[PDB]
Design a protein around this ligand. Structure first.
Ligand SMILES: C[S@@+](CC[C@H](N)C(=O)[O-])C[C@H]1O[C@@H](n2cnc3c(N)ncnc32)[C@H](O)[C@@H]1O
Ligand SMILES: C[S@@+](CC[C@H](N)C(=O)[O-])C[C@H]1O[C@@H](n2cnc3c(N)ncnc32)[C@H](O)[C@@H]1O
Ligand SMILES: [Mg+2]
Ligand SMILES: [Mg+2]
Lengths: 383, 304, 362, 50
């Protein structure tokens, strides 16, 4: 029997996954610049590889930044500090290939303009999405996936599971049922967890620990039953992880960073980018809008699209899809959005306080669904 | 944290959902259960399994139980069936723990010949549905003298599917103006909101905590009298649609002998105690059915 | 009015990120020619005067990476320092670790174009193709390789499907030389590029044109913006439509299910629409650890199918075998034709096996 | 081309072990040799510049 049921799955990766190392390093570099120069123009790409971190991209800033220190301190905090773990901050190669921002981009975007008039730093499309299925207005699949990795990191850093290393991958498969445009998560179907580990600890001590200390502490019992499949350390000997024998890049976990397959994505990455890059600021803005609509009671689920042209301040297009979860028309919801939001980057930066150096926080465990971020605090709407 | 516990059976169904909602929010510690599709919000409980019913009631220590039946009326052929009985067990174990059981029953226990009907009036069901609802009252009342019986007419509410209410099933036939549709203009009925019935269930239960004299039969119903045909026209009027494709059949249906013509319930006893809520049908059905508008349904997909 | 806008973008061959995708798949192609069973996971990074290869390779092939990268950059059009990049003089760095010898995928199809793709991205892709073509002709000799495009289309919802009405907005940014002036570029982009790509019935007096909106675009390619493999995955796929699980395509060989099953899911989706069973469809394939066949397949036909989801699933099960091994055999995925996929989108063009609709039997 | 060549930078701080052995906490005149080593000087009267 089936009705209108389906499976959906989302992954998250821990801080030590090579791609997410790059994301966090790029955001550490951005924060370092914003501490001294709030108007810094940053486009930092990081590359992680056996024994190597390379910084490539472009930065115009008044800050004096010691790239060797910021990169190595980041790798330190992530937990790579010895050969035994496959990577050491003290002894890794750090190359830097950073130049100024193209003057052609500067003149065309932000030079000699009032803040509210600065153009989009690029063309692009960005999506925002919210769903009433969790308190945090996010898909349960991605939320559980993130929180599992966060738990592993927690239990690693407070010594309670000292055999854990920084690299990890989780996949949460939830069984869903459609409900008049909304989606009801019914049960957790499958949970996969691969995590990098000590030489000493035996396989089934880890597996016991992943179930009893990680999953039990994270996933409400209401979603777990006797049929739920657990794939804990499925391959077995995952002692080799992180950059060693692997190659990661900034912006190769954009789906993990956002909605875990749900809603939509326009393909712009977040990390290493100041507010003038609308891939970040407009995506943050669009999440804010989507969450505001659902928390404001105007719909149970929603997807928002916005687009920009480089050097132009106002969005080229804005669109709302409520999946038929609102009594009001999508056009009416658009009218409400137009009245309550100003989606130019020069304004978004004020409303969301995006010159603050708090970006490294966002580089793991997802950019959405968390308490402290301005874009997760819904706006009271007037209509 | 609230200390006032309640157990709603048939919490998965239209009525149960509304009841569990009305309680939970207003400082009750509301738990719901159901046979199928209960998880994750409610407990998986087969009322016909006495061991299951025993354990959940033993472990929960409810101060009140509201016994609803899931329901999905095609019924409204009007023949069979039920093997319950399980209202007996529920009544048994409600007493063992000392919980006030409210038994939801129907106006189909009556003849529908001399309306209105009082709580005192002699029942006379023309069908097997009416029969078992009447048996349940007997089976409950004689297994628990501290229990109550709330009789209610046809139901509607914020359904998850059109088929969950015999009022809401009509909505597609209303919407599709290009096809003519026949509907009963013979049987007299009183559509009643489960949200209203839920409020009544909370008010009645909250009285029994003060006054132990609350027991026996009670009647609630919406005040607006409507046929199946008049309801359909009221639905079109709410959503501002044409109803001329709707044709009334004043002749009784194929099994008109099994259907009570007008089983109007007299709600005077319950009106006296300050118990009662009546959402107007034109406002109630609008809030109920808007998600099932053709244009909304087209949009209700997983992905854009 | 039931009307909505939707936007998609695409980029040119000279876009830093697309440079990297093409080189990554050029490395793959070269390996597959000598060794059909080569395991490749090759990332490319690009910046002023630099191409860096990084990744894992288990292959028997001996590849001249110098020649591979340099010929790719040549083909793309970067052949002088005046253009910001030059195949003859750039730095090629190799850091590949070579040795000697699960997932959720989405496929999507819509009947709004012949190629069975969203109009927004099809046009975006074709505008870049046109620029490349007119650059190579000599018709517009001031053009340079790096370019971006973005198309916003006004749609009308029609019983599950989406009906293009008009083009709302068009963006074109293309790197150029230092002689040509701004009015000449804008006239050309409008008259020689757009009007040769977009059907006239979609263009009108209200269509907005942001052409060379930055005002100057001389500095381009890896000099103006660092490039990385796998940073254009929405451009590679459905331009904001359908759905995406996370995996990049380029630099990965066919044994990665992220690539080859995404191709297969597309194949199914297109076959359903071209077979008249749907006007629009999204196909979900869940794979699971320790099973060859998909663990579960869902089919969202947006109400555009007369047949139910279960009926469509049954049709899918007897015409398709979605076990990785069979997919690479059926679609011929061991062959070295991955470089042509690395620009202008992986879906839409008939030349690919997964874009050849299977005649369905049910 | 200076405008378009790759430039890569891999510069770190001087070793703290070297710094303490050589120049930290000393008057400039008592600075130690930065390393061991041998060095020659040479001159010849065959040209005016020696
Ligand atoms: C503008 S850049 C990204 C932001 C850049 N990293 C920065 O430092 O601001 C992204 C893409 O836009 C295009 N681009 C580069 N320079 C441009 C210009 N002056 N005008 C318009 N587009 C440009 C290129 O295709 C480039 O890869
Ligand atoms: C002193 S280093 C030259 C580094 C450079 N002069 C500087 O100070 O940045 C030259 C050699 O001396 C040796 N060396 C390095 N650290 C040293 C230390 N702390 N004490 C003595 N010798 C050292 C190593 O063999 C090294 O190759
Ligand atoms: Mg970018
Ligand atoms: Mg990029």
């Amino acid at each position: 029997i089936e009705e209108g049921t389906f499976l959906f799955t989302s992954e998250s990766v821990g801080e030590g996954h090579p791609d997410k190392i790059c994301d966090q390093i790029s955001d550490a570099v951005l924060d370092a610049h914003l501490q001294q120069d709030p108007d810094a123009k940053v486009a930092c790409e990081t590359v992680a590889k056996t024994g190597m971190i390379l910084l490539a991209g472009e930065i115009t800033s008044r800050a004096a930044v010691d790239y060797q220190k910021v990169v190595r301190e980041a790798v330190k905090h992530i937990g790579y500090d010895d050969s035994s773990k496959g990577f050491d901050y003290k002894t890794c190669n750090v190359l830097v290939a950073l130049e100024q921002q193209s003057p052609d981009i500067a003149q065309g975007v932000h030079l000699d303009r009032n803040e509210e008039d600065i153009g989009a730093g690029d063309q692009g499309l960005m999506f925002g999405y919210a769903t009433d299925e969790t308190e945090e207005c996010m898909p349960l699949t991605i939320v559980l996936a993130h929180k599992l990795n966060a738990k592993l990191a927690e239990l690693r850093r407070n010594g309670t599971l000292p055999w854990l290393r920084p690299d990890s991958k989780t996949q949460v498969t939830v069984q869903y049922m459609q409900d008049r445009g909304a989606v009801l998560p019914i049960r957790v179907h499958t949970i996969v967890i691969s995590v990098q580990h000590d030489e000493e600890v035996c396989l089934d001590e880890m597996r016991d620990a992943l179930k009893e200390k990680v999953i039990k502490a994270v996933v409400p019992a209401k979603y777990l039953d006797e049929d739920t499949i657990y794939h804990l350390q499925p391959s077995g000997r995952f002692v080799i992880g992180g950059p060693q024998g692997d190659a990661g890049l900034t912006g190769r976990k954009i789906i993990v960073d956002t909605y875990g397959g749900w809603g939509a994505h326009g393909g712009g990455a977040f990390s290493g980018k100041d507010y003038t890059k609308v891939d970040r600021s407009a995506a943050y803005a669009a999440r804010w809008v989507a969450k505001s609509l659902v928390k404001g009671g105007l719909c149970r689920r929603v997807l928002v699209q916005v687009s920009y042209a480089i050097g132009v301040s106002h969005p080229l297009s804005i669109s709302i899809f409520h999946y038929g979860t609102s009594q009001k028309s999508e056009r009416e919801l658009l009218e409400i959005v137009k009245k309550n939001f100003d989606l130019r980057p020069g304004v978004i930066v004020r409303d969301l306080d995006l010159k603050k150096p708090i970006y490294q926080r966002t580089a793991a465990y997802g950019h959405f669904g968390r308490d402290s971020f301005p874009w997760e605090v819904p706006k009271k709407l007037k209509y | 944290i609230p200390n006032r516990r309640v157990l709603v059976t048939g919490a998965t169904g239209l009525l149960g959902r509304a009841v569990h909602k009305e309680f939970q929010q207003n400082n009750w510690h509301a738990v719901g259960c159901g046979f199928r599709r209960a998880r994750p919000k409610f407990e998986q409980v087969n009322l016909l399994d006495s061991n299951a019913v025993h354990h959940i009631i033993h472990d929960f220590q409810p101060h009140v139980i509201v016994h609803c039946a899931a329901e999905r009326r095609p019924d409204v052929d009007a023949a069979s069936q039920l093997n319950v009985d399980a209202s007996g067990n529920l009544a048994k174990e409600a007493a063992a723990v000392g919980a006030f059981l409210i038994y939801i029953s129907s106006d189909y226990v009556f003849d529908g010949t001399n309306p209105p009907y009082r709580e005192e009036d002699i029942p006379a069901p023309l069908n097997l549905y009416g029969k078992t609802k009447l048996d349940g009252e007997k089976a409950v009342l004689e297994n628990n003298l501290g229990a109550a019986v709330l009789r209610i007419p046809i139901l509607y509410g914020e359904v998850e599917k059109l088929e969950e209410s015999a009022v809401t099933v009509m909505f597609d036939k209303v919407q599709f103006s290009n096809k003519s549709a026949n509907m009963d203009h013979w049987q007299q009925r009183f559509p009643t909101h489960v949200k209203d019935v839920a409020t009544v269930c909370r008010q009645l239960a909250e009285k029994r905590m003060l006054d132990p004299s609350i027991k026996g039969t009670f009647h609630w119903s919406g005040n607006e009298q409507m046929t199946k045909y008049e309801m359909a026209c009221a639905i079109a009027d709410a959503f501002n649609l044409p109803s001329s494709h709707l044709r009334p059949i004043t002749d009784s249906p194929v099994l008109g002998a099994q259907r009570p013509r007008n089983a109007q319930l007299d709600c005077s006893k319950l009106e006296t105690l300050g118990i009662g809520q009546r959402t107007p049908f034109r406002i109630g059905i609008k809030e109920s059915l808007w998600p099932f508008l053709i244009d909304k349904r087209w949009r209700q997909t997983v992905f854009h």
